[PDB]
Design a protein around this nucleic acid. Sequence first.
RNA 1: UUGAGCCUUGAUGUGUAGGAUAGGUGGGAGGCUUUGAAGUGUGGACGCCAGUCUGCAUGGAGCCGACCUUGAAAUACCACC
Length: 134
Amino acid sequence: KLTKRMRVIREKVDATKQYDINEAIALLKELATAKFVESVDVAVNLGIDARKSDQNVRGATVLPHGTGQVRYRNDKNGIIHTTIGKVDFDADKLKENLEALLVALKKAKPTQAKGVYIKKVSISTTMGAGVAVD
RNA sequence: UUGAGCCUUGAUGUGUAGGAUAGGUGGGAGGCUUUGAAGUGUGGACGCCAGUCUGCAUGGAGCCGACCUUGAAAUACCACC
């Protein structure tokens, strides 16, 4: 279950703490500490009834340095999440892609949908923790 | 004593693919691993009783998912769950 590596990375930072977005882009480098090149994803929990097709969320936004583009679509449960780029990019380069996807996520709220949009959104890498960001 | 709600988290569901009791989206060719390891074993749990899960030493440092066969994943792993 628990290995020699996930003791460090899952607990080097506190995933239960809501970090700032400006702090998050530098702390994901610790979460992306690996031999290969990972990809950081923003995980947004949306409680829509995705079986009702009128509440579906779908779109894509722009990346300023290619890959290139980023595409997002929800599952059949309602949780919608996608990447923002590679982790070899600079923290200020992942600054640009994170808010552009986030604002377009706020733009695509359905008319009949209700409730609070963001609860515990997390920057999730390929193998790092789901660090709580706001 | 007995209901209801909360958390870092252990497990959780063969028609048919197939080694396998896959519920999905998200990620990439790396994890697991000399931070004590594969397979056995059993207290206990285990089902649609085809067969599996939790703790470890005597054991002793090895095991895996591409593609392909599939309506689709074939947990090595992480994350939302």
